[PDB]
Amino acid sequence: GRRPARCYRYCKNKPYPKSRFCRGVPDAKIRIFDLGRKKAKVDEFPLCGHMVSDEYEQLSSEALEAARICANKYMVKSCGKDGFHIRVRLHPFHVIRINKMLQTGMRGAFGKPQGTVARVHIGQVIMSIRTKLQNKEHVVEALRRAKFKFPGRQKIHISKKWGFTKFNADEFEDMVAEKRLIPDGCGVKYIPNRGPLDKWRALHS
Amino acid sequence: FVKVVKNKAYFKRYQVKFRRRREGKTDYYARKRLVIQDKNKYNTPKYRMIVRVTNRDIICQIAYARIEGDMIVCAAYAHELPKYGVKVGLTNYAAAYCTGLLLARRLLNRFGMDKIYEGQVEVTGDEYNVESIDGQPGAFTCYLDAGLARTTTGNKVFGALKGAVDGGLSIPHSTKRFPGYDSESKEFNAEVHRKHIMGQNVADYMRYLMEEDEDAYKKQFSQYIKNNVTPDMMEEMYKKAHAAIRENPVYEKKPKREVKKKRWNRPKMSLAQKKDRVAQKKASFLRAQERAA
Amino acid sequence: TNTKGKRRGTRYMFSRPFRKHGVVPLATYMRIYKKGDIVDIKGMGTVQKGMPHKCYHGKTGRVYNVTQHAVGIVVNKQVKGKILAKRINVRIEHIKHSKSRDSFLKRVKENDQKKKEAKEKGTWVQLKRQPAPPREAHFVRTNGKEPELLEPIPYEFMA
Amino acid sequence: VSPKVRKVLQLLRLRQIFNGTFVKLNKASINMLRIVEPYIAWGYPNLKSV
Amino acid sequence: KENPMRELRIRKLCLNICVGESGDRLTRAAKVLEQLTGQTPVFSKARYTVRSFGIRRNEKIAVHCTVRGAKAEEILEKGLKVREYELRKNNFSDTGNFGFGIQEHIDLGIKYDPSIGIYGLDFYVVLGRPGFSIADKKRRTGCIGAKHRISKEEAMRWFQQKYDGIILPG
RNA sequence: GUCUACGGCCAUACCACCCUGAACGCGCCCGAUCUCGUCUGAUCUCGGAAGCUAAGCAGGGUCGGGCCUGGUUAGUACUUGGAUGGGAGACCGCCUGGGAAUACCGGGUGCUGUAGGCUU
RNA sequence: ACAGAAACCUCCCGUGGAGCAGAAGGGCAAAAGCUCGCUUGAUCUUGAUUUUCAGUACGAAUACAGACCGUGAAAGCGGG
RNA sequence: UCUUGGGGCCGAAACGAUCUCAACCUAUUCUCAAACUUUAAAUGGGUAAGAAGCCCGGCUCGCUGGUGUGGAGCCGGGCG
Ligand SMILES: [Mg+2]
Ligand SMILES: [Mg+2]
Ligand SMILES: [Mg+2]
Ligand SMILES: [Mg+2]
Ligand SMILES: [Mg+2]
Ligand SMILES: [Mg+2]
Ligand SMILES: [Mg+2]
Ligand SMILES: [Mg+2]
Ligand SMILES: [Mg+2]
Ligand SMILES: [Mg+2]
Ligand SMILES: [Mg+2]
Secondary structure, three states, X not given: OOOOHHHHOOOOOOOOOOOOOOOOOOOOOOOOOEEEXXXXXXXXXXXXXXXXXXXXXXXXXXXXXXHHHHHHHHHHHHHOOOOEEEEEOOOOOEEEEEOOOOOOOOOOOOOEEEEEEEEEOOOOXXXXXXXXXXXXXXXXXXXXXXXXXXXXXXXXXXOOEOOOOOOEHHHXXXXXXXXXXXXXXXXXXXXXXXXXXXXXXXXXX | OOOOOOOHHHHHOOOOOOHHHHOOOOOHHHHXXXXXXXXXXXXXXXXXXXXXXXXXXXXXXXXXXXXXXXXXXXXXEHHHHHHHOOOOOOOOHHHHHHHHHHHHHXXXXXXXXXXXXXXXXXXXXXXXXXXXXXXXXXXXXXXXXXXXXXXXXXXXXXXXXXXXXXXXXXXXXXXXXXXXXXXXXXXXXXXXXXXXXXXXXXXXXXXXXXXXXXXXHHHHOHHHHHOOOOOXXXXXXXXXXXXXXXXXXXXXXXXXXXXXXXXXXXXXXXXXXXXXXXXXXXXXXXHHHHHHO | OOOOOOOOOOOOXXXXXXXXXXXXXXXXXXXXXXXXXXXXXXXXXXXXXXXXXXXXXXXXXXXXXEOOOEEEEEEEEEEOOEEEEEEEEEEHHXXXXXXXXXXXXXXXXXXXXXXXXXXXXOOOOOOOOOOOOOOOOOOOOOOOOOOOOOOOOOOOOOO | XXXXXXHHXXXXXXXOXXXXXXXXXXXXXXXXXXXXXXXXXXXXXXXXXX | OOOHHHOOEEEEEEEEEOOOOOOHHHHHHHHHHHHHHOOOOEEEEOOOOEOOOOEOOOOEEEEEEEEOOHHHHHHHHHHHHHOOOEEEHHHEOOOOOEEEEEOOHHHHOOOOOOOOOXXXXXXXXXXXXXXXXXHOOOXXXXXXXXXXXXXXXXXXXXXXXXXXXXXXOO
8 A cells, every 4th residue: 555665764854744745644652661560660660772773764654553453462472561661762754755656757746644753763772671680582572573563773772771761770779769850650850959958958867 | 838939940940130120210111112213323323312211310310321331421310400490399290391391401402402402481382393404413313212111191301301302302202291291082172281391289278288288288298388389480490490400411520539438337248257167057056055054 | 045034043043042122221222423433333123214135243343323212334345256245224233233343442552542642651662463472481380299190990881 | 285285385395205304393394294284204302313 | 106107098899780691771770880889880791502591692781880999989888878887797808898788779879860760779888008009010010928918707898897886706 | 249320232130038238328217487289298300318228228048030152952853956766645754054932951140331338 | 690612801831932914034022023103215306236137128126315294302203 | 530421330328438541631652744843054145344434623504492402414634
């Protein structure tokens, strides 16, 4: 139904968002970016692996949907439906056009919206998985399988940050002990030595 | 619940107006037209007569604008009028006239043109404009800066303006806003204006109260009674004030006196003091918590 | 093609800076401009009268005429292979005294004084500027501290 | 030769290949030599070279 | 001892009759206010044309006026009397004002006349302190300051003492 | 130390809340005969001087928000000029020069001109 | 009070999130918006200039200059 | 979270109790813009780097004007 993904692999056009100028864009193939036990607290899943893009290219919303299912099914089978949390880190905002031929030719060749893609840079995280530290093997295998749904080269990388947080795993526990970090569900709020001293009193009372 | 309008972003985008505007003192739409000189006149000063009536005082100043701020050429205050025999009513229309007259004479004395441009020595309350005398220094020209005052007929800024032109200052103006202008006929009654300049409307009120209710008279005119100012003598009180103003309009600055260095408000707490206070507060909070347990 | 509109492409050029909208400070109107002065042209969108054309925004000219509100400026404009001395009328809001020559006038006064003062003292002083010379020989004391050894850091995939 | 390089080479007077000139160094001239960097070989001559 | 310049006072009493339409009724409604207040009231036009209410834009549908000074107390006492000096708690605004309604103006001591009819009306009281007017003046206008504002509790207290009124819950 | 009138720059000056304000001021404040204007002397205008710093206003405070200014981010991202450099490409590295911005961390919190007062 | 999501009155917050004929962009808060009062600078006239540009025309626009005016207390503003 | 709803749910029944899911609000969080932006490069565009300058004394004016003020113009003189 759609052209082979080699036709829209490269970031050749400027970003083309669905806006008030580009009307008629069909809905993206991927509508869910978080799945698994999304409600696990920050402290339940210390491990985090990433699928990191090694190329500057465009991924179709179809391949994001395909990879998500691929990585999600393998985790449900090797860790259980409540043993992980998957977050797809790319959103298909750039719109790809089509100049449909059956005949004007190249006259009036500007194309109609055909789909959506995510523009991914080198070193940019495609999708992330957080789970328990004893499932590190199953995370790598899930992301290794999902690579086959994407064009180009992607690298797997087990992060040093605690879960989906921005704070290193080697010190995350210490910061929570002294109330520099406050769990707020999947993540942690950061407490600076700033602001009204009342907020400090509340945290220490 | 509704969105906090004054959130963090409301302050990141907020643009404060000019300080004097925030204070509600200056009208910059009017100021731009009042003070800005034509560019082909270069450094030629553009003078204006600032009149500001406070709750208790009338300030008359002559100033021109410079880039660093206005320069006050001359200033006359109504609280100076007791030196000339006017003890009370220092914000009424007659006082405004005297203050403006005092401002005019003081300026002309300073430039040495007081003998040349004596203005209307005998007050008639009628349209008077000074004519520059050929072969003499030109008559001083200033414009009236009314400020935020509402310029209806009888506003006291025009009382000070009338006193200033009568002193020999050239100020463009019409009689439409002097007291005595009848809006219906579009005719101006000079005599009604003269009554106000002499405070007869104030004198009439005193009599009208005395004849009607004596108790109200004391409440309204308690300082007139104390200073022994009666309705009949007010007109000659003001006429004498004008002459004394004209006779010697110069200002003898109050002699400054060295005073003991005293501080009447706190200075800023230092970083160390502000830092220690937090440390003391934190120690106090935990100390209390331990006691409770 | 494009349009020949007078203000095409001035969306940002003539807009006011961030949180600097509103009233124009009156010192902008109190500046004194004289024949021969050098002024930088900068269109201000708050005042739409006497607006310089976009091609003159960011150019510096010379005042030759002064009127009640505006001035006449002789400013070079390049059109294709020639440069034209153009005469524009610009309200004084959209200009400012150029400080490019002030450094020169400061130098002229300093030059003349040194020229005058040195003459009465029978000495030759330098007056002409010079380009920055190569730095002269010098000693670097170690203060008994061995220079810190630096090494390249290992690679790490901090992805 | 690009227009900027071509003008700087004429100012150094190196209008022909394997032409040589002395240049006294300073911020004005060192930055000119940077522009014509792909087109010149230069260095510090010793007394015997002079 | 409280500073005398903190005493609560009635800034103004605002009477409003929204007749809902123009014509004879609205003219009659104007006369009711004039008898009650002794001053000429002013008409208000509809901001927007609303079909459901049968009012067109710029159509006079309401008449109101402001009463200050002693007369505000006299007209306020009449209305409070008809209410038996009882107000619900929700009748007080968070800014220190309150109001109430009157179904028939004939209860306010106005004799009925056949050529006028019967009208209801709203009663609103704006409370304040000295210096509240700095926010209404042309020169150097300012804000009164938090410690000077009137709270909902302050107004209810004022109502209870001033008239011995009763504040019903709910 | 400080205020009043008129200002320049226009938050280091703003916003929220709290404390303190000698003197003179600036105010709030008391009235509506006159000038003037209102449905309303509320505002505007006019005539005053019983009271009060309650508020405005001034100074100070807040591990205050903002704002100003540095540090880090980082010689990173980006970039001028170069090669018969790499790679199927996408792109990337190096040579010669220039060189950012968040988050995060710290410091600061109006200066000042003219004229005129108060403060032994 | 009727009165309700929506009628009208009151207080508070409100940096413009409105409005300024229209497309959009810019500009604007004691205003350029809204409401009143008076009006015809949308008038007569010679040159210079800018924009497109060939540095031609028109069109449109900018500073002035000379008359008659309007408005305002006035500074001023206005020849759409 | 009651400031509005869907489900429930014990009733005499209410804004009584009870949860529960939503809208809402407050802090965070993932990802973006050719027709967004507080910031903000590199390369780039204009101008200046003197004798047509600088500094003195004087004269003209119907222009501006409190002022023999301002501005411009002109004359003479000195500085390489
Ligand atoms: Mg095929
Ligand atoms: Mg393309
Ligand atoms: Mg005005
Ligand atoms: Mg407060
Ligand atoms: Mg005292
Ligand atoms: Mg009053
Ligand atoms: Mg106090
Ligand atoms: Mg802070
Ligand atoms: Mg201060
Ligand atoms: Mg206006
Ligand atoms: Mg004209």
